[PDB]
Amino acid sequence: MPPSEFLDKLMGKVSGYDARIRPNFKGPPVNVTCNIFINSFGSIAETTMDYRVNIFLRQQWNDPRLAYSEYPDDSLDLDPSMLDSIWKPDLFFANEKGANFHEVTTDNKLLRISKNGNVLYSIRITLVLACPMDLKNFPMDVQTCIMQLESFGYTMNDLIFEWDEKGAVQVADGLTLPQFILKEEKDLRYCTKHYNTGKFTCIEARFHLERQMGYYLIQMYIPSLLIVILSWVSFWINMDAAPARVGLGITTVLTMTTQSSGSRASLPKVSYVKAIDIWMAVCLLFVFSALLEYAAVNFIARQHKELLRFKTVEEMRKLFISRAKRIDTVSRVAFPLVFLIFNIFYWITYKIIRSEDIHKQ
Amino acid sequence: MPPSEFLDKLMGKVSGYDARIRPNFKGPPVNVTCNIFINSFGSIAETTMDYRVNIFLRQQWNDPRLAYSEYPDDSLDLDPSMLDSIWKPDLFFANEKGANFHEVTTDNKLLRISKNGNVLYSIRITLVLACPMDLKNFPMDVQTCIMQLESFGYTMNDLIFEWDEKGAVQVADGLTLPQFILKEEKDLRYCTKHYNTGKFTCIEARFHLERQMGYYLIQMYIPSLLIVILSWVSFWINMDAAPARVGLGITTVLTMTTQSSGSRASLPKVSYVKAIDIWMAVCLLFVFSALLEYAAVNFIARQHKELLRFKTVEEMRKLFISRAKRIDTVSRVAFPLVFLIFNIFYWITYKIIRSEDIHKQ
Amino acid sequence: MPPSEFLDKLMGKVSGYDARIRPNFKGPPVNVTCNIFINSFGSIAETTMDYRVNIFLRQQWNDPRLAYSEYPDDSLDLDPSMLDSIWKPDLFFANEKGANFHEVTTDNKLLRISKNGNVLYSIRITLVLACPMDLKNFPMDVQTCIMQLESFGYTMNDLIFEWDEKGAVQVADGLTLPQFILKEEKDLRYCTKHYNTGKFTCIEARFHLERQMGYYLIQMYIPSLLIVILSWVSFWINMDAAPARVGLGITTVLTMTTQSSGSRASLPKVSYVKAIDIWMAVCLLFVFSALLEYAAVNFIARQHKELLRFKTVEEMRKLFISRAKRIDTVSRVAFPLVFLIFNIFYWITYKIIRSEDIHKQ
Amino acid sequence: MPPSEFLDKLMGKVSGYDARIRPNFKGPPVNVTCNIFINSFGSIAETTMDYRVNIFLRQQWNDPRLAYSEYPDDSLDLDPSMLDSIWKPDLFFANEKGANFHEVTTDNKLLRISKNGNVLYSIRITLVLACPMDLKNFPMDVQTCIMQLESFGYTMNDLIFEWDEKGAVQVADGLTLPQFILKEEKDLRYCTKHYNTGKFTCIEARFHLERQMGYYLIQMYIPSLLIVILSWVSFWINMDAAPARVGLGITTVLTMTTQSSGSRASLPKVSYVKAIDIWMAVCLLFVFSALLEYAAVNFIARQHKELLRFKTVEEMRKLFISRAKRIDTVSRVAFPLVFLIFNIFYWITYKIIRSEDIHKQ
Amino acid sequence: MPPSEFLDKLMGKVSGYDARIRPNFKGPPVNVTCNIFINSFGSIAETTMDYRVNIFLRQQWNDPRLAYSEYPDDSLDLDPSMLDSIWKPDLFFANEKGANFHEVTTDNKLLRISKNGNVLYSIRITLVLACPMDLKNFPMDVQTCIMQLESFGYTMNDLIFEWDEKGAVQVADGLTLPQFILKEEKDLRYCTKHYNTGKFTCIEARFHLERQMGYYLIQMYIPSLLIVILSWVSFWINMDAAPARVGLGITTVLTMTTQSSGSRASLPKVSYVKAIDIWMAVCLLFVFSALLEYAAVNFIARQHKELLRFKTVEEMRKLFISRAKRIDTVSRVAFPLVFLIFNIFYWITYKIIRSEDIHKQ
Ligand SMILES: CC[C@H](C)[C@H]1O[C@]2(CC[C@@H]1C)C[C@@H]1C[C@@H](C/C=C(/C)[C@@H](O[C@H]3C[C@H](OC)[C@@H](O[C@H]4C[C@H](OC)[C@@H](O)[C@H](C)O4)[C@H](C)O3)[C@@H](C)/C=C\C=C3/CO[C@@H]4[C@H](O)C(C)=C[C@@H](C(=O)O1)[C@]34O)O2
Ligand SMILES: CC[C@H](C)[C@H]1O[C@]2(CC[C@@H]1C)C[C@@H]1C[C@@H](C/C=C(/C)[C@@H](O[C@H]3C[C@H](OC)[C@@H](O[C@H]4C[C@H](OC)[C@@H](O)[C@H](C)O4)[C@H](C)O3)[C@@H](C)/C=C\C=C3/CO[C@@H]4[C@H](O)C(C)=C[C@@H](C(=O)O1)[C@]34O)O2
Ligand SMILES: CC[C@H](C)[C@H]1O[C@]2(CC[C@@H]1C)C[C@@H]1C[C@@H](C/C=C(/C)[C@@H](O[C@H]3C[C@H](OC)[C@@H](O[C@H]4C[C@H](OC)[C@@H](O)[C@H](C)O4)[C@H](C)O3)[C@@H](C)/C=C\C=C3/CO[C@@H]4[C@H](O)C(C)=C[C@@H](C(=O)O1)[C@]34O)O2
């Protein structure tokens, strides 16, 4: 039997197929079992709130008309061009942008018709999937990225989408994310879309994403610590040298302000407080408190010099000078100890909150 | 009756349909009732002055020729490919950019023909809708975003567009906007476009948008307050220490200037004064006034030292030194009280103006 | 008479039309009268030197073959799809980028054939029109934006383009430009393109654009004034306090430099001096002159202290100290008066130059 | 003779043309003479290393089959749609990106068939041409931008490309470049591409571009001069005032550093030294040398005060104080004279190197 | 024999070819030998992690049906339009974005059919190839960029891809990369993709890229050295002048911080430490240590003045003053020597690590 005649015969104008009609019309719904292979993952953007993926979508459904018995070979892979009339099931992604096809050299498609009528349809597509991301704890957090595959134009009674029994989501070996870690466990759950038109089958997969803390520690946490240490250095400088201590406190407060403003620039304009805001707030409060401490010392010395040059004035001079010296001596010890207590408290609470988020999943 | 023959018969070359002609030609106008479902809303940009939406446009019109009585089933959902010849009514969005269709896997369309000839047409489209936004009160404001659906090429006598009686605009459950709040109430009003060619039916929907004030309070209002408090701290420093007080006043004025310039960078170049401009102007006036106050104190002490080293000169020395000390003492109390009075006045007026805008709608 | 047969008959294969041929071939030129309606105007970019417009281009020409007498109704609006063969006259925009068509829901076109053979053709198109803009006076200027409609492939003897007698350019009511004001008067003038191939008809419309000065006054002119006032404040500070006065002069000069550099960033790299350059140059000269004035005062006091500690030396001490005090006293009065004279001179000259540009048009 | 029949006859299915075959097959090569008209030139980007042009490509070749004698009129301009089968010669640009066609209103093409069989083909295209640009002398330089027109799929024996005898490159009158000057003289030279497949004809045109020095003088050269003059001002300030002189030297060095870093931001990351680097290096060396000079003066005065307060100590005090005073006195004269000598040397050498580049062409 | 009839005959409807079927069906696999010519290479982006190339892909395979003996000429180059039915083998790039074709003037393709049935197919395509790049040593590193050519829809038994025996990868002469150096040696290795669908042939080429160190030395290494030298200059200034030394140390630490933050902005957010981080960390530690050294000197002098003004107090005054003077004297020598030792250690280790990376390849 010539191959050309057989392939033509399946699509044969003489034969009745009428691609527009679904298989087993006025009957039980067509069941489509689909599994995606994730070729590339990346380009996650917090500001735009979307991530880009490249996937091989594979759809398996049974068509009775396409059954053939003339050829013993059951595999019978076919040319992708003659995919015009194999009743491609309509599918679309509920949350998407873009979703272009790949036309390079030849269309990236794979049509394979089994002997019993099972059809394997494989298409390569890049998806700009948009997923909302909670930025409550910006430094360390776990983001769930969800892709929904939903039918358009065929109701649930008409068409049903089911996740593949084995290997529904497959990740390419060696695929890595620079800013994130992809969890191996995957959530395969189906939610049925309800509209005024009717109920349409939909299935969705959830990808847990864990943000690596290596960059943020170096970029943000270590510099702020340096600025706070510089403000601590200001205590050892002489109280008499007012421009040096004042300028040092001012410069550290200004540096903390510009660093805090600059860090959060590459982020969406969310209205809720973040972990990074708490850290920046406390560190900026520390440097501001150091400047206030010098202002208090200078004012006490001013009162000393006021009583000095216009009665127990000598006693008052010793008291006020001892008072200022005492504030400096207590301050140099007290400031790092309090900062250490805050640092361990903040890290412990955020680590257990991260553990709680991992507990919830 | 075979399904293929029936579907072919409706579109049947043997039968007369002639898609180019509208239903009930040389007769009463075709009435189209349309309701949109908003799948995704976001990407609002003040600078570009546009917002992006993804919608399921649904159009219902009655075609007498498409009436069928052979099949008892009235629903009879059909394949979207055979939408070439169902007389799709021309519609376009009056204010748009882009407006691409979704071609992923299969075209996102839904053709449903009822027994009486009613046609349900549902298409998914992303619209870069451009709406002018009044930025009189930039911090807190209510923006109305308007989408117009207007016929092109068919006059009002020829074709009429009407909003659906029930559920004209439907918002997807759980849809949220990071920077804005979407009001539940919606304005459905039709305005008829008039041109030299003729009058064309148009209908429009207004979406009230309320801008959340959570981010702007943290990002802009709280830092400016910190700079003003730093300028107040400058009073407690000794009058003799001229570089410290001068440098502190200069640094705060410079910081206020760069913060004010940086904040308004992500905004269109509108010529009218905004609320944020008033707040930045007053706070910068406060820090500038603090620097002028120190300049006055230093000049009074200079006149004291002028009379000191070259008659009532001793009396003049006590007067001038008391005068400078008095200006400092009055200033430390006076500056925060005046700032508090301005702050409550500004918040009260802007809150009642916001209430007035909500009153107008 | 059935409508379908009549519409088919006009385009009838049986009848001779041959769309490729122009009307009244080997005869007088086809005369096309065209008027544009400006739906949206905006997105003007100085750096890119282009502006984006959305227009309804309407072309009216007379075709004798399309005359019909069978139907009394003269209007007879038709479906836009059957525009393949109505001899669309070739038109293109001489200075353009992009120029995409709008394909949303259905093609945005309007074909209307009159009884005598007059054809009304209306298409909606967005044009990235590029117009050179003179930036001699950047702050306040009038820019003329020109759109040219020129034939391609048909010579002047073959085809002629004429502006509509009434309402050649129509602007949508309520259309506004945030950064510019659009003048009501319009220049309709035709210039004939000459090439080695031949002479091709072209027509052009000029849109005068006036740049609003509200933003630039607040953003650029008011801060520079603040920096100059700060430099004036430096005079009242004591001459003995060298770090305070020196640092203040340095900071103001640096601030003026960074403000001048930052302002002109969003501008093309033109080689000619602008009004904003003159203003920045003079204000920066003022702050630089203030720093030089303090350097002179400090040097005179230095010479006093040189003569003081190693003859009329006492006389020289009084002279030099009086000299420095005199320079400060004269300087505090002299600097704002001179700046006021410059300010009124600059505003008067630029206002009359703006008036002269309005005089020229 | 009816026009429709004649035009149809040339493309006539009855007649043999077979568009796929080239003219005079198995014979001498087809000779194509092509001239381009440059409608718009601009959008040159140093970083991306490309420039965008809009051109009217005109190709003239002789086809014997298209000869006609039935009509006396030799011009016989034709509709651009029937360009499917006039054997368009394959041409492509060797160094390109984009290269989109213009589809606005109607395709921008011009087919003109002469009586002898000469075919004139004119297409409008925008080309993102990428040309490497030597940035040895960044401030003033001459860049050559080259466009190559090369055949694809037809060997040199099969097809030959030749530049038009008269007017090969035509520039639109009044076309101007904001940042560059276009030289009138043009290089028309053909280079034959050699591949393993075979030899393919190619022709190329070189556009000399001269960069205007007006902007760079104002933006970069004048500010650096201001910073150097400010460092010179530092000498007149008293040696005793250590914070003023130190802060002034620091601020000028920092300002020079940020200006040098900021200027070269809009440039590719080339590894070779540029003229602007030499200028920034020398000016920054001048301000750094001024700060070192003050450090030397302060150290000499320190040694004076060391010998002062713990033998010829008095003699040493006069020597050291005279030494510091001498360094200041010599420095104020010496620094501008040396800078003037460098400035004239740099301008003379770069001007003669520019002249040498113009000499080479 | 007429050429048209012969070309038509090969594609002849009368003859059996059936393009959908592969050559020698139900037989040994089709063997495709492919070599790419790299026309342009560049646009490497670290942040996006992709590079753009323009290539001439050439595929050679043998088709028995296309054998011809009627014409003696074996070359017989053909028109690219009749490439619809020459059984183009499906190929796609495993890691790609974009991959557009070039449609300018005519499609850029070359079909050449040999006498024995060998088919040469050459297409020009621009590929946005994405390759992960290890940034362990950011300053100097060697990056391997890999392009994979893999079959889609034909299994390994069905179709095999092989690299050309001679000249598999050809680079255009004179092609250069501004920021990188391309190694002449190339890795041609084939890896077979394994999927659940089956095994598909793939071949890949590796391009070693060496990053030039010329720019980074000037832009980053030389400024940091300048800041460290400025901090060394701070030692020569008098210990009594507390504002000058304090301000100088603060300014250098701040400058180092902003330079370090600014440099790494154009880089991906990787979590691992880089060479540039080590260099910035050490240099910033040096400037911070200089500021701590002045704080220690000032504190020792403070203790001297504490013992001075409220027993061996005189002895303590000489000891403490000598101690501070000793710290300054030792510090001025010690700091550059230690920095020199670090500099040679860092350069030696990174150079041998670069040599080790070149050793591994
Ligand atoms: C320690 C902080 C105080 C403020 C110190 O600051 C100073 C001086 C001494 C102070 C005590 C300044 C500080 C650096 C240190 C010098 C320390 C370096 C040798 C490095 O650091 C160590 C510590 C670091 O552990 C957080 C540790 O990371 C590991 C974590 C993980 O393995 C467990 C793993 O992921 C990976 C292997 O790496 C690692 C051993 O490297 C240096 C690499 C840190 C980067 C330095 C700079 C990079 O750009 C940063 C910032 O953009 C710039 C603005 C300021 C720099 C700075 O902030 O400078 C900066 O941060 O000295
Ligand atoms: C007056 C200048 C000196 C330097 C004064 O500076 C300071 C203190 C006092 C000095 C004398 C600083 C200056 C502001 C003033 C405070 C003045 C405010 C109340 C406002 O101003 C007035 C004057 C203004 O008339 C030019 C006038 O505009 C009209 C013009 C038109 O109607 C005729 C019309 O279009 C429209 C209605 O508005 C208007 C009544 O509002 C305030 C709104 C000005 C904006 C303030 C700031 C906005 O961001 C600017 C800049 O990005 C930032 C960097 C510095 C600010 C500043 O520069 O601060 C800034 O400019 O105090
Ligand atoms: C002269 C330099 C020293 C440093 C002077 O600096 C200061 C004070 C006095 C010092 C001696 C500062 C300096 C400006 C001058 C004031 C001079 C202005 C009146 C103008 O200048 C003159 C000189 C200029 O000739 C180079 C000359 O150009 C011609 C060249 C060509 O015709 C032969 C032709 O192409 C075209 C016609 O224009 C022209 C007559 O205009 C002013 C227009 C210069 C621009 C001023 C500023 C623009 O933004 C610049 C920079 O972004 C900012 C950061 C600092 C400013 C500055 O740097 O300020 C800045 O440059 O005063």
Side-chain angles (χ1 to χ4, degrees), chain C residues 18-21 25-26 49 57 59 87-101 121 123 125 127 132 150 152-155 158 193-198 200 242-243 246-247 250 253-254 257 260-261 264 268-273 277 284 288 291-292 294-295 298-299 302 305-306 310, chain D residues 3-4 7-8 35 37 39 46 52 54 56 58 71 73 76-82 102-110 112 120 122-124 126 166-167 170 173 178-179 212-216 218-219 223 226-227 229-230 233 236-239 241 243-245 247-248 251 255 266 318 325 328 332:
Chain C
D18 193 21
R20 295 164 296 176
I21 324 189
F25 201 39
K26 300 310 196 199
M49 281 229 179
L57 174 57
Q59 301 174 81
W87 193 77
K88 295 181 293 298
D90 49 68
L91 186 145
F92 88 102
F93 295 79
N95 51 336
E96 66 176 73
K97 309 160 195 193
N100 47 21
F101 273 134
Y121 179 45
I123 54 173
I125 297 168
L127 276 64
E150 145 192 359
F152 202 117
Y154 276 121
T155 54
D158 214 338
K193 303 298 289 188
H194 268 93
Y195 297 126
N196 56 22
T197 56
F200 304 87
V246 161
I250 293 175
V253 169
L254 261 278
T257 298
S260 177
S261 73
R264 309 166 17 212
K269 309 253 199 83
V270 305
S271 303
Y272 47 78
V273 174
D277 288 349
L284 194 144
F288 184 78
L291 181 54
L292 295 174
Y294 178 67
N298 193 355
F299 183 78
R302 276 168 33 86
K305 188 83 181 52
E306 261 181 28
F310 305 93
Chain D
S4 179
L7 52 97
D8 170 77
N35 50 87
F37 168 88
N39 179 220
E46 292 83 355
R52 187 182 51 69
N54 191 340
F56 299 176
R58 286 148 201 173
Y71 275 62
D73 190 81
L76 189 142
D77 193 331
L78 310 163
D79 196 271
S81 92
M82 45 174 298
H102 287 72
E103 87 291 358
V104 51
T105 309
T106 54
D107 290 2
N108 298 359
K109 291 173 174 56
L110 179 168
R112 185 175 305 171
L120 174 55
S122 188
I123 54 173
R124 172 166 183 256
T126 62
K166 64 94 179 179
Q170 294 176 335
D173 48 332
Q179 210 184 343
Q212 298 168 345
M213 219 176 56
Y215 158 83
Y216 293 96
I218 290 180
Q219 187 62 20
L226 174 70
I227 305 302
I229 289 186
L230 213 59
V233 161
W236 301 90
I237 313 299
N238 190 7
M239 46 183 301
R245 294 194 63 171
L248 201 174
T251 305
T255 309
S266 51
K318 308 302 313 312
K325 269 167 40 173
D328 256 355
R332 60 202 32 175

Side-chain angles (χ1 to χ4, degrees), chain C residues 128-312:
Chain C
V128 182
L129 293 171
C131 72
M133 54 183 56
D134 190 65
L135 288 184
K136 188 61 61 179
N137 305 337
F138 169 52
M140 62 298 298
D141 57 356
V142 175
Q143 303 300 349
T144 286
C145 309
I146 192 149
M147 68 157 58
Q148 323 187 282
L149 293 61
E150 145 192 359
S151 153
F152 202 117
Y154 276 121
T155 54
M156 182 101 199
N157 49 286
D158 214 338
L159 183 86
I160 294 165
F161 274 173
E162 220 65 58
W163 271 120
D164 207 354
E165 276 328 298
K166 64 94 179 179
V169 174
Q170 294 176 335
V171 176
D173 48 332
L175 168 74
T176 204
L177 279 85
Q179 210 184 342
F180 281 94
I181 284 173
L182 187 53
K183 300 293 210 45
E184 306 313 316
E185 182 252 349
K186 303 285 209 344
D187 303 356
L188 309 163
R189 58 180 294 274
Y190 51 82
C191 55
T192 304
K193 303 298 289 188
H194 268 93
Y195 297 126
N196 56 22
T197 56
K199 48 184 292 210
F200 304 87
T201 187
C202 175
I203 60 171
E204 67 193 348
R206 312 177 163 232
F207 298 99
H208 306 300
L209 278 190
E210 178 158 323
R211 164 178 281 108
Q212 298 168 345
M213 219 176 56
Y215 158 83
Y216 293 96
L217 181 70
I218 290 180
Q219 187 62 20
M220 304 173 180
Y221 285 76
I222 298 297
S224 67
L225 188 55
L226 174 70
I227 305 302
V228 175
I229 289 186
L230 213 59
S231 286
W232 298 345
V233 161
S234 167
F235 297 139
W236 301 90
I237 313 299
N238 190 7
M239 47 183 301
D240 305 304
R245 294 194 63 171
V246 161
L248 201 174
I250 293 175
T251 305
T252 62
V253 169
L254 261 278
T255 309
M256 196 65 192
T257 298
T258 177
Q259 172 184 351
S260 177
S261 73
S263 77
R264 309 166 17 212
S266 51
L267 263 202
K269 309 253 199 83
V270 305
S271 303
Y272 47 78
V273 174
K274 317 187 204 59
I276 180 65
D277 288 349
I278 296 295
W279 171 267
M280 291 308 181
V282 170
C283 290
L284 194 144
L285 188 162
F286 268 86
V287 301
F288 184 78
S289 297
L291 181 54
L292 295 174
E293 178 268 358
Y294 178 67
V297 172
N298 193 355
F299 183 78
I300 292 300
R302 276 168 33 86
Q303 196 164 358
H304 146 82
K305 188 83 181 52
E306 261 181 28
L307 292 169
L308 176 57
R309 308 294 294 102
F310 305 93
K311 42 193 185 56
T312 55

